Design a protein around this motif. Sequence first.
Motif, PDB file in Angstrom:
ATOM      1  N   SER C 165      99.104  63.057   5.974  1.00 51.51           N
ATOM      2  CA  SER C 165     100.174  62.233   6.509  1.00 51.51           C
ATOM      3  C   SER C 165     100.623  62.660   7.903  1.00 51.51           C
ATOM      4  O   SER C 165     101.317  61.889   8.569  1.00 51.51           O
ATOM      5  CB  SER C 165     101.368  62.241   5.557  1.00 51.51           C
ATOM      6  OG  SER C 165     102.005  63.501   5.562  1.00 51.51           O
ATOM      7  N   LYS C 167     102.013  65.974   8.726  1.00 48.36           N
ATOM      8  CA  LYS C 167     103.023  67.029   8.759  1.00 48.36           C
ATOM      9  C   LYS C 167     102.514  68.256   9.507  1.00 48.36           C
ATOM     10  O   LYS C 167     103.131  68.727  10.467  1.00 48.36           O
ATOM     11  CB  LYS C 167     103.412  67.421   7.332  1.00 48.36           C
ATOM     12  CG  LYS C 167     103.883  66.284   6.454  1.00 48.36           C
ATOM     13  CD  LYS C 167     104.228  66.735   5.037  1.00 48.36           C
ATOM     14  CE  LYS C 167     103.067  67.317   4.275  1.00 48.36           C
ATOM     15  NZ  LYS C 167     102.041  66.301   3.988  1.00 48.36           N
ATOM     16  N   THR C 169      99.932  68.484  11.387  1.00 46.21           N
ATOM     17  CA  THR C 169      99.573  68.098  12.748  1.00 46.21           C
ATOM     18  C   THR C 169     100.749  68.237  13.709  1.00 46.21           C
ATOM     19  O   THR C 169     100.661  68.946  14.716  1.00 46.21           O
ATOM     20  CB  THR C 169      99.056  66.657  12.740  1.00 46.21           C
ATOM     21  OG1 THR C 169      97.985  66.543  11.799  1.00 46.21           O
ATOM     22  CG2 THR C 169      98.570  66.226  14.096  1.00 46.21           C
ATOM     23  N   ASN C 264     104.493  68.718   0.230  1.00 52.65           N
ATOM     24  CA  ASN C 264     103.768  67.558  -0.286  1.00 52.65           C
ATOM     25  C   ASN C 264     104.468  66.971  -1.516  1.00 52.65           C
ATOM     26  O   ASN C 264     104.028  67.124  -2.653  1.00 52.65           O
ATOM     27  CB  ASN C 264     102.322  67.959  -0.583  1.00 52.65           C
ATOM     28  CG  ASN C 264     101.367  66.793  -0.535  1.00 52.65           C
ATOM     29  OD1 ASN C 264     101.484  65.854  -1.309  1.00 52.65           O
ATOM     30  ND2 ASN C 264     100.420  66.838   0.397  1.00 52.65           N
TER      31      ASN C 264
ATOM     32  N   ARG D 275      90.699  69.405   1.636  1.00 54.42           N
ATOM     33  CA  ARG D 275      90.255  70.420   2.582  1.00 54.42           C
ATOM     34  C   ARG D 275      88.743  70.573   2.669  1.00 54.42           C
ATOM     35  O   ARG D 275      88.272  71.337   3.512  1.00 54.42           O
ATOM     36  CB  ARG D 275      90.901  71.773   2.255  1.00 54.42           C
ATOM     37  CG  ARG D 275      92.319  71.946   2.794  1.00 54.42           C
ATOM     38  CD  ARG D 275      93.431  71.328   1.988  1.00 54.42           C
ATOM     39  NE  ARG D 275      94.682  71.521   2.704  1.00 54.42           N
ATOM     40  CZ  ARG D 275      95.705  70.681   2.685  1.00 54.42           C
ATOM     41  NH1 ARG D 275      95.795  69.722   1.784  1.00 54.42           N
ATOM     42  NH2 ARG D 275      96.684  70.836   3.569  1.00 54.42           N
TER      43      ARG D 275
HETATM   44  N1  LIG Z   1      99.842  59.603   9.601  1.00 53.91           N
HETATM   45  C1  LIG Z   1      98.526  59.757   9.477  1.00 53.91           C
HETATM   46  N2  LIG Z   1      97.805  58.733   8.976  1.00 53.91           N
HETATM   47  C2  LIG Z   1      96.493  58.898   8.793  1.00 53.91           C
HETATM   48  N3  LIG Z   1      95.748  59.980   9.024  1.00 53.91           N
HETATM   49  C3  LIG Z   1      96.488  60.980   9.507  1.00 53.91           C
HETATM   50  C4  LIG Z   1      97.847  60.954   9.764  1.00 53.91           C
HETATM   51  N4  LIG Z   1      98.281  62.186  10.230  1.00 53.91           N
HETATM   52  C5  LIG Z   1      97.195  62.917  10.230  1.00 53.91           C
HETATM   53  N5  LIG Z   1      96.074  62.253   9.811  1.00 53.91           N
HETATM   54  C6  LIG Z   1      94.764  62.830   9.542  1.00 53.91           C
HETATM   55  O1  LIG Z   1      94.920  63.836   8.559  1.00 53.91           O
HETATM   56  C7  LIG Z   1      94.469  65.106   9.063  1.00 53.91           C
HETATM   57  C8  LIG Z   1      95.388  66.195   8.577  1.00 53.91           C
HETATM   58  O2  LIG Z   1      96.745  65.856   8.903  1.00 53.91           O
HETATM   59  P1  LIG Z   1      97.875  66.875   8.449  1.00 53.91           P
HETATM   60  O3  LIG Z   1      98.981  66.869   9.431  1.00 53.91           O
HETATM   61  O4  LIG Z   1      97.188  68.145   8.142  1.00 53.91           O
HETATM   62  O5  LIG Z   1      98.372  66.222   7.080  1.00 53.91           O
HETATM   63  P2  LIG Z   1      99.590  66.655   6.116  1.00 53.91           P
HETATM   64  O6  LIG Z   1     100.702  65.689   6.087  1.00 53.91           O
HETATM   65  O7  LIG Z   1      99.927  68.059   6.431  1.00 53.91           O
HETATM   66  N6  LIG Z   1      98.790  66.664   4.718  1.00 53.91           N
HETATM   67  P3  LIG Z   1      98.761  67.968   3.755  1.00 53.91           P
HETATM   68  O8  LIG Z   1      98.758  69.150   4.638  1.00 53.91           O
HETATM   69  O9  LIG Z   1      97.554  67.970   2.914  1.00 53.91           O
HETATM   70  O10 LIG Z   1      99.963  67.889   2.908  1.00 53.91           O
HETATM   71  C9  LIG Z   1      94.447  64.944  10.575  1.00 53.91           C
HETATM   72  O11 LIG Z   1      93.448  65.786  11.133  1.00 53.91           O
HETATM   73  C10 LIG Z   1      94.083  63.472  10.750  1.00 53.91           C
HETATM   74  O12 LIG Z   1      92.678  63.276  10.689  1.00 53.91           O
END
Ligand SMILES: Nc1ncnc2c1ncn2[C@@H]1O[C@H](COP(=O)(O)OP(=O)(O)NP(=O)(O)O)[C@@H](O)[C@H]1O
Lengths: 362, 362, 362, 362, 362
Positions: C165, C167, C169, C264, D275
């Motif tokens: 989602s 986060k 990133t 999450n 992952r």
């Molecule tokens: N809002 C979004 N919609 C779709 N793809 C996204 C989005 N944000 C990030 N991504 C993709 O998801 C990957 C990981 O994003 P990340 O910020 O790690 O997710 P997160 O919310 O932390 N998920 P998680 O860590 O598993 O709880 C990125 O490298 C993108 O390829």
Amino acid sequence: KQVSWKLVTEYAMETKCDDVLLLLGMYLEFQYSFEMCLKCIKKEQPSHYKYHEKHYANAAIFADSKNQKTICQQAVDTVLAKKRVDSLQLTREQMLTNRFNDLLDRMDIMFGSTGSADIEEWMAGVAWLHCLLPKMDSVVYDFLKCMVYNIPKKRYWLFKGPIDSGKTTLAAALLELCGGKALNVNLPLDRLNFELGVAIDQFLVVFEDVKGTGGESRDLPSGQGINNLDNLRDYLDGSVKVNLEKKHLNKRTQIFPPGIVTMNEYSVPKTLQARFVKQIDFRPKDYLKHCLERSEFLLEKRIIQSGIALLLMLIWYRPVAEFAQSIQSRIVEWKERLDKEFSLSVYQKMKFNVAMGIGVLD
Amino acid sequence: KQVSWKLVTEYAMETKCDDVLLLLGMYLEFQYSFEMCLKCIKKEQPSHYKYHEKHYANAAIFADSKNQKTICQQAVDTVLAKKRVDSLQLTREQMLTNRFNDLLDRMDIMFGSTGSADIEEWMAGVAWLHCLLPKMDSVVYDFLKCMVYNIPKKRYWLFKGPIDSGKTTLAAALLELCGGKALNVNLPLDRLNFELGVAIDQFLVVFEDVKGTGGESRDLPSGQGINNLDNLRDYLDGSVKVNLEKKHLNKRTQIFPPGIVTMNEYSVPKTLQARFVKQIDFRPKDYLKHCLERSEFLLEKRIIQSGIALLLMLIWYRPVAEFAQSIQSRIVEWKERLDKEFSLSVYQKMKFNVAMGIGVLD
Amino acid sequence: KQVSWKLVTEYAMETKCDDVLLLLGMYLEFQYSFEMCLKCIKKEQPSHYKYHEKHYANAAIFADSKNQKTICQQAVDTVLAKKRVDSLQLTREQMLTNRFNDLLDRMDIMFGSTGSADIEEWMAGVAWLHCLLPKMDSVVYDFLKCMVYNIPKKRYWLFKGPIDSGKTTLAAALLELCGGKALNVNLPLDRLNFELGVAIDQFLVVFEDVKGTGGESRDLPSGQGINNLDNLRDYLDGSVKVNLEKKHLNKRTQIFPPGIVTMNEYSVPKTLQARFVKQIDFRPKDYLKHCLERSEFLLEKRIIQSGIALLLMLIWYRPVAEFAQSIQSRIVEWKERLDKEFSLSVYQKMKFNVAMGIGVLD
Amino acid sequence: KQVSWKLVTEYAMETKCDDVLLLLGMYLEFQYSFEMCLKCIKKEQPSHYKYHEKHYANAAIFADSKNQKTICQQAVDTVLAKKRVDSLQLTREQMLTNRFNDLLDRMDIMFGSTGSADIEEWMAGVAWLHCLLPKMDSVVYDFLKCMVYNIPKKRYWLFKGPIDSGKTTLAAALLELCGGKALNVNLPLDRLNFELGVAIDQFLVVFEDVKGTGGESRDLPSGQGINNLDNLRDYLDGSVKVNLEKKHLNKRTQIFPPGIVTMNEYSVPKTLQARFVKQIDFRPKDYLKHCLERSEFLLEKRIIQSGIALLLMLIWYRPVAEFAQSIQSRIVEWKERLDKEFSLSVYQKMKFNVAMGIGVLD
Amino acid sequence: KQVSWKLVTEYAMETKCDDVLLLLGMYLEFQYSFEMCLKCIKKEQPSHYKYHEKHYANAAIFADSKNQKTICQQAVDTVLAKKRVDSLQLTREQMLTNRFNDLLDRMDIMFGSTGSADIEEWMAGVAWLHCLLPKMDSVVYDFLKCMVYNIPKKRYWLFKGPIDSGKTTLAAALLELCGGKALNVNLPLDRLNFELGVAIDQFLVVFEDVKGTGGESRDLPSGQGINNLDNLRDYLDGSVKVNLEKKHLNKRTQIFPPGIVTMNEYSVPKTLQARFVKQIDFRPKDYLKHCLERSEFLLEKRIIQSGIALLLMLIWYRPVAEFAQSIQSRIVEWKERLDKEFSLSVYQKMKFNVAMGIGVLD
DNA sequence: AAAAAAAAAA
DNA sequence: TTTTTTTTTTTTTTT
Ligand SMILES: Nc1ncnc2c1ncn2[C@@H]1O[C@H](COP(=O)(O)OP(=O)(O)NP(=O)(O)O)[C@@H](O)[C@H]1O
Ligand SMILES: Nc1ncnc2c1ncn2[C@@H]1O[C@H](COP(=O)(O)OP(=O)(O)NP(=O)(O)O)[C@@H](O)[C@H]1O
Ligand SMILES: Nc1ncnc2c1ncn2[C@@H]1O[C@H](COP(=O)(O)OP(=O)(O)NP(=O)(O)O)[C@@H](O)[C@H]1O
Ligand SMILES: Nc1ncnc2c1ncn2[C@@H]1O[C@H](COP(=O)(O)OP(=O)(O)NP(=O)(O)O)[C@@H](O)[C@H]1O
Ligand SMILES: Nc1ncnc2c1ncn2[C@@H]1O[C@H](COP(=O)(O)OP(=O)(O)NP(=O)(O)O)[C@@H](O)[C@H]1O
Ligand SMILES: [Mg+2]
Ligand SMILES: [Mg+2]
Ligand SMILES: [Mg+2]
């Protein structure tokens, strides 16, 4: 020529520095010439501009030496050694008098011509903080008296109350005013050794939000907190010396400091309730929330958390006859400095603003 | 000129400092000239004024030294070496005599010409404690003889009676006079093994508040603590050596220290009853309850629960020939003081007032 | 001739080198003659070619030395001492301004004519990041303002949302923008003592993907992280100082940094919710995923999680008046560069391409 | 004359000793007279015979020395320091190119006229490994790109399948090819910290044969491994820097290595599956079993586990253009050697032999 | 004149002494004059009388040393350094050949004129051991081959069978023959790390009587052993280097030793069974019990547990050509000695005696 | 107990 | 200044 280790120890004592890396960093900044020094020209930090010219000569040799950290360790141990002598010898009212006297020096630079603080903002804090509990000024006076008399068993205060109810704001101010440390007891007991070790030579300890049992029906999570405290009865009552361990040092035997337990709506055991003198029931006031919302400077400058704010309240509300005789000469000056700044009319208006949930300064 | 490490060791030995930073701190106070130093002029702390004038010259060279922590570490390890020699090589009579004449040094400080205590309150504490049991001074003197002789089986005393009978006050007073610690055998049998490790190198132990099993038929809270204790037969008897386990450290063998069991009016299984040489029935006394509510200063300066209060009782009641031959010369001086400051009529009038439930000391 | 320890401290300071082995390794590269060195000829790394010519003479002597790790440890201590002096002396806005100057130095090298980076690929990252949340430049500025205004209890932000989602990133970009450390609270509570010590003198901390309890029906594995965060409430509040630990160094007592929690979709206790001033609900957008599949350089060059992308976003969207006076000079220069390189037309086509889920550079 | 500490460091650098006792042991072998030495006459170990003649003069003085382990410590720390510089300063393709040069140097020893190894047996290992997974050389190249690009969240590969399916065989080969460490995360969460610190400054990690839960329907015993990994999903992402701990040293903050998870048909959480960029489903093949028992030299010489077998597979199958510019020169030379010794008819008969379950060399 | 650290290192290397206190004690008793040394005249321990006359001069100077443990530490670290070099650089057949030479040296001492053993008693052990298991000499030779070859996942043997079947008797004998250590995997899982660290640089391990679950219907106690062992699949595989941990020491990376698992008739999971090559079913034999009841010297002297009994079995039954060519010279003279002292008919009578439960020597 | 970090000898 | 010797924790244990 060679580094005088005594000048470094003198600087460390003068600035009361008990961090070896801060002392190293502070002293190294003296190696540049004072005649061209931007820090001395701006007068940013008194811990520099007072001392640079004096220590410049030693700091240039210090900057070339091969055992800089050894020199700083000894100076830091000299400061930690004086604290232990003071802790073991001084009468407990002299401890509080020395802490007050340090706050009063710190106040004089805050509100001075080189200052950066407005007494009206800090007195708006005093007014807000006096609204929090019925007759707060008297309650702080017999809290101070309690911590000075330190009567065994009858040493500790319990701050129960809801989430966002102000117990951590008052405990933080009492902590600064009396000069203590905040301790965490929610860890497993064999991590607690070195954390209780921080209470060594302190005046208060505050146990911050100790977690209890049975809270689940109220969405209050359970934890080791109450079980640790109810094992530590030997520490709370102060009947005997208990042994506090800290690194690079022998384990000090001392009577553990008195202080404050801050707690949410957990049920408290009968064995533990027997060892708290007074319980303050904090509860949220609808108007106080709106008052802060309309008065952001109280939180940004951390006014309501401050022991300087509670000290200003004691200037205002209590007689001069209550203060220590060596500090009465400073108290009566700060009395007239508040009298020459706030009329009783403006104070009563701004306190009324708090009671209305209006912006305090309006 | 050199720093003599021998003189620092000599100050440490005379002052009995276990602590490196306390020794460092106090020795650095001597670096200032004795000609005009205010702590010598005021004579507040004996650990300074008695020693500064001879240690000044060494303290001046010590204050320039680069070795300062190393010097103090050797001086501290000399005092700890002395303790370990004495711990293994003294007889129990000498170990008690050393705690007695240490307390006579504290009494000579408290009640000196520079004193900070008034004997009238302490003798009211003696009169209160003496009234708590029939022939209290014989109870205390015979307890001391038991702890000093450490005779197998004839080794433990049982204190039992209603809630608030004073059992824990007398245990706490006896702990300071002999030196010792409190143990909690109420724990589950798992944790009991680390709890018993507290007893290593103690002269005395108290078992606090043994929660017996069968007594809840009259609302005594039921517990396993008595049946835990019943299993610990070799720890009570003191014939054989037991293995004691401080947490994180390896097991020491020693004869378990003598002690006191403090208990409510529970039923005791007969084989545990056989292991106490005396059972003392503490009972609540209404006139003592009224007197505590009226002589209430005794609870505030904690005279009632101190070893010096029992030592004052022994100096008042017992003849000098019962004290160890080396301390007798100090007991002679303290008898004459306690007589000249209190004619028997004063103490008798106090004891009458206590017995009448009257708190006034007259 | 002898090694200058001072010159090694200058190299460590100019390089801002926290690690003893990194300093040892880099300074040993200077022992070779600079007239022939391939790394000076090729200009591969700036921490070499800027400094080798000065330090060659000293490094040849250092390479023969027997002290080498002691020399580097004193130099590293000087870098750490500077960080502790700055931490206590500098305003939080000056700390952020110093970090932005660091990133702008890095941006000038990175987008120079020698620079390896293409500004059009990095602005395509700014376009993708702005599409992640509504009003992200406002959210980023609000976060900076919230970390600079270290307001007690209003210190922490919660990022909540499902898998992939965004986060981590955004948190990783805000972590590079402000400077800080990511802490793992999911590990057991006893060794958590040394994790939290990594927050010593840092501007932020991020608590990364902390695990809750319940929600196993949602196919979310349970874990300790939220219960561990419901302990440590005094670290999140920052009304009080907390004691932080490094190995062999003594405890450091400070206010624990503000920052971010990412999780999450677990159930947060109301006690813990009260510590978070903002919850940002992240939401998967399939157009962003399809855009990354067709604009893979964003992932491979780590553009969308870089602090330089968020800084470029702030340079694009925010007025110069919101930056500090010192850095406004440098930011008008970067604004006129971006407006030369990009018209608004190129950038609005990039955002249209992102919302279409095609390649951002199409 | 004195020992050169520089020459010991030069030996440690050339032989790349991480280990103080291995360095001490090796260098003390150079005591003895070069002219006679049996190890140089045999040319048994290259870390001896290439260096003894040069180091003999220094090693004689080193053997008389009184601080030998101190000399070896500095030499080892120099090697570890270069390793930390290389991890931060080299591109990740330069790292792999260096590792390929080291394996090619080892192949030049193994298959030269001094060498113990027959390439016919090793190419039969290439034949056996190519039959394991469809398009194996493409899978190996796809793995190498994945590890070199280090794309956040797209960094880990999952190897999944039953007993004796080939997972650890290919994981061990890829670990030797790329360089890295294997980690057992099945051991409990409190011992886990120092395990993860084995990944400090490594290129890959392999999480070998981790255990899930809910496998008893298949006679797969449950365990902690998958729940431990899900607590570490912060470390598998590689977006943020994790803090890695080895005993007594302070935490190092780095991006955790890319790698492989091998697991035996357990169920994996969605949070952890996110992952893994690619999952390889290993199926056991009857013909590979019958081939190996008639080709026993493959298991005795550990050929199918070897990175040199995978490197020979890349030399056989991949174009020259896919290798880094620096090694293309050596890779061309090795291609000509394999085409000279193996006709394509020999190799395709080897694959026919593997598929029929016949001995590869028949 | 100065103490030669080199002569202490010679003594340690010739003794193979890796214990610092043992080396200190051994070297100090050389300080007394050789001419009257009672330990030399009595020839008590070979580590003294061989070395004393040459080391006396140096030991006299060593006695007056101030740094004795520093000297011994370097000599111990030299012996550990040689062991680590030999561990990485010897072939496993050489390692075993070194161990057989060390055993043959013990045999020469035991059966020489100064010795204390009768070969007829030790050969009665060979007869008893050969009756334990069918084709016992092939089993031992197959085990030696298995341990020397160390084929991945084809390198552990399972000894399975009911109470008192010979499992630990043969496993202990094999462990002295090859060298190595026994491991107790039945611990709680958090203590298991330091069990497994016993295997560092060892040639064998034996897992002694691992306990499973679900043997209780056949009166076997349940335990954790088999489940703990299934957490260690990658250790039993030997494909990858595992990370092994001694207390207070950092993790060594090595291939875990091959070895034996011994257990009662618990059910083994297929994941763990796939790690064992050969399962040997041990059964209780009436004639071995009746025989030992009559031939007690086999137990009282520890003969049937001894590697020297198995080495004599290999000297008897196996061709010379199966031994490594270095040791063939010593093996032929030992065969000639056994052919001298034992007729085949004496040995056949021993085997016939033990087959009937008559005493072996009858 | 052993190492990492630190202090004393000549 | 060169070289050798010393203190102390961490870790381990505990939970
Ligand atoms: N809002 C979004 N919609 C779709 N793809 C996204 C989005 N944000 C990030 N991504 C993709 O998801 C990957 C990981 O994003 P990340 O910020 O790690 O997710 P997160 O919310 O932390 N998920 P998680 O860590 O598993 O709880 C990125 O490298 C993108 O390829
Ligand atoms: N009695 C009060 N009524 C209303 N608002 C209050 C009150 N006391 C404090 N606040 C607000 O609550 C914030 C947090 O106060 P704090 O002292 O942390 O409450 P608390 O009782 O400690 N909460 P907690 O720690 O969760 O139990 C302050 O910054 C104020 O904004
Ligand atoms: N004889 C007495 N009667 C009533 N109160 C007393 C008596 N002696 C002491 N106290 C008071 O009770 C407290 C000390 O009694 P304490 O020694 O704890 O009794 P105890 O026998 O240990 N009680 P318990 O723990 O219930 O078994 C103090 O508050 C005293 O003021
Ligand atoms: N695909 C295959 N088909 C048949 N035999 C194989 C295959 N792969 C490997 N083997 C054999 O199995 C042995 C062990 O292979 P290994 O890679 O350890 O299996 P694995 O997939 O890891 N099984 P496990 O670790 O128990 O889950 C090898 O030494 C070969 O003898
Ligand atoms: N096969 C056998 N039949 C009968 N008695 C035997 C046999 N092997 C050994 N013994 C006797 O049993 C004793 C124990 O042998 P040992 O090898 O320790 O048994 P074990 O199977 O390892 N025991 P356990 O590990 O408890 O299952 C020996 O000392 C002999 O006296
Ligand atoms: Mg995340
Ligand atoms: Mg496997
Ligand atoms: Mg057995």
